[PDB]
From Swiss-Prot, chain A:
Organism: Arabidopsis thaliana (Mouse-ear cress)
Function description: Probable ATPase of unknown function. Its presence in a non-photosynthetic plant (Epifagus virginiana) and experiments in tobacco indicate that it has an essential function which is probably not related to photosynthesis.
Location of this fragment in the whole protein: 54 to 105 of 2294
Coiled coil: none
Family recorded in the similarity comment: Belongs to the Ycf2 family.
Name recorded for this polypeptide: Protein Ycf2
Subcellular compartments: Plastid, Chloroplast stroma
Curated annotation (Swiss-Prot), chain C:
Disruption outcome: Embryo defective.
Role according to the record: Required for plastid development during embryogenesis. Might be involved in chaperone functions or play a structural role in the thylakoid FtsH complex.
Protein name as annotated: Probable inactive ATP-dependent zinc metalloprotease FTSHI 5, chloroplastic
Interval of the full protein contained in this chain: 979 to 1027 of 1320
Family, per entry: In the N-terminal section; belongs to the AAA ATPase family.
Complexes and interactors: Oligomer.
Subcellular location: Plastid, Chloroplast membrane
Length: 44, 132, 49
């Protein structure tokens, strides 16, 4: 129910804490799609 | 039959084509929960309704619990992208659910009098919205 | 749709500020007749708010 979010949203530390987890999640997702060996053939 | 007629496992795509099963599963869970809650918030005992429920999915369809079970059936069958098994599942579940819906509908018609009659006149579609 | 003559004959003992607050209470009592649930109305009210 959007009101459940909205009551807490309408009520400096929290934003920075939430944006740190944003760049950490971005890092983990970006590292997640690449194979550790990009060139299997050139190392083969 | 959905398992077998469906293709081999890791070849089905991803990306933006796997959002449909997400939203359909969310819809069937939401509609089933609403149907069960609206059916259980009025009955005194386990299944003993007092008034007629005509709220939530009941104002779109006469049997939303059965159609939600139907829709998660279709969700599993559509996750593996097999239309024919979805159709046969639809046929058999339509037959049995329609039989059981007919007995329960005549029971509440007999038991409640005009109330369920006008409720059924308000919403005719028994299983699928404006299809059945 | 409301014949206000008979409503005036039903509010003879009343006062102008209550004569002003009559219509919304009248609509509420009109909505009282049908059969409806609290939580659906509450959900719609929350969504619209």
């Amino acid at each position: 129910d959007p009101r459940i979010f909205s009551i807490l949203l309408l009520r400096r530390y929290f934003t920075i804490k939430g944006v740190v987890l944003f760049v950490v999640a971005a890092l983990l997702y970006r590292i997640n799609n690449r194979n550790m060996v990009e060139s299997k053939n050139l190392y083969l | 039959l959905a398992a077998f007629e469906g293709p081999e496992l890791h070849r089905l795509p991803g990306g933006w084509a796997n959002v449909g099963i997400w939203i359909l599963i969310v819809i069937t869970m939401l509609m089933h929960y609403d149907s069960t809650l609206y059916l259980a918030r009025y009955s005194e005992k386990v299944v003993v309704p007092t008034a007629v429920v005509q709220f939530g999915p009941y104002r779109w369809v006469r049997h939303p619990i059965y159609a939600s079970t139907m829709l998660l059936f279709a969700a599993y069958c559509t996750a593996l992208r097999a239309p024919l098994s979805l159709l046969f599942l639809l046929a058999v579940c339509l037959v049995y659910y329609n039989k059981k819906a007919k007995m329960e509908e005549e029971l509440m018609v007999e038991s409640f009098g005009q109330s369920y009659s006008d409720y059924a006149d308000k919403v005719r579609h028994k299983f699928i919205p404006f299809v059945y | 749709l409301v014949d206000w003559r008979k409503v005036s004959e039903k509010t003879t003992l009343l006062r102008p500020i209550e004569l002003k607050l009559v219509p919304m209470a009248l609509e509420s009592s009109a909505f009282r007749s049908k059969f409806l649930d609290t939580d659906e109305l509450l959900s719609y009210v929350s969504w619209f708010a």
